[PDB]
Structures are given as C-alpha cells and as structure tokens.
C-alpha cells in the first residue's frame, strides 16, 4: 500500500537503492545473531565519542 504510492513500474528494475537493501542485510544478520561474532562478517560504521 505504501509502495503503490510510488507506482514503480514492474519492468524498470533497480526498485530500491543498494544501501537501503544492505540495511536489511545488516538487520537480518543482527536478528540471526546479535553477537559481535556475527557482526564481524559485514561492514559497519560506528559512531562513538565522548559524552
């Protein structure tokens, strides 16, 4: 129902930006195993700093 707002033609391809799809990739790895032992498999960007 949300995608129907976009009205994306079936024949066009490239339905979603690659990184938006990689977000699902990282999310599924996190869901399968949230431990760092499985996080280590794919790239991430960590934002860390002083309080």
């Amino acid at each position: 129902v949300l995608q129907k707002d976009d009205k994306g033609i079936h024949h066009r391809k490239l339905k979603k930006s690659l990184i938006d799809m990689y977000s699902e990739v990282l999310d599924v790895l996190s869901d399968y195993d949230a431990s760092y032992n499985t996080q280590d498999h794919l790239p991430r960007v960590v934002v860390v700093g002083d309080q």
Binding site: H10, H11, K13, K15
Partner: protein, 51 residues
C-alpha cells in the same frame, strides 16, 4: 607421407570417411549447450525483475 597428410589436412570428409564421428559433434554440442544455458541464466535473472 607429409604431402599425403597435408592432403588429409585439406579434406574434412577424408577425416570422417568412417562414420564414427561422435567425438567432434559431441564436443561442439557441449560447448554450444554451455553457451545456451549461460545466456538463458542472465535472461531469466532479467525475467525475475527487468520484466
């Protein structure tokens, strides 16, 4: 003998005078079937979203 074998080189029929030619035909068929499937694989990947 070198001259006669050159005449052998010239004529392909003189190579398949005895009809045991499975070797050459089978090799050609293997290579061409691999090309067939290689192109069909990309075509079907285009069917999955390129429609």
């Amino acid at each position: 003998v070198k001259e006669v074998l050159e005449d052998f080189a010239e004529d392909g029929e003189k190579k398949i005078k005895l009809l045991t030619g499975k070797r050459v035909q089978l090799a050609e068929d293997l290579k061409k079937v691999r090309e067939i499937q290689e192109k069909l694989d990309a075509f079907i990947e285009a069917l999955h979203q390129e429609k």
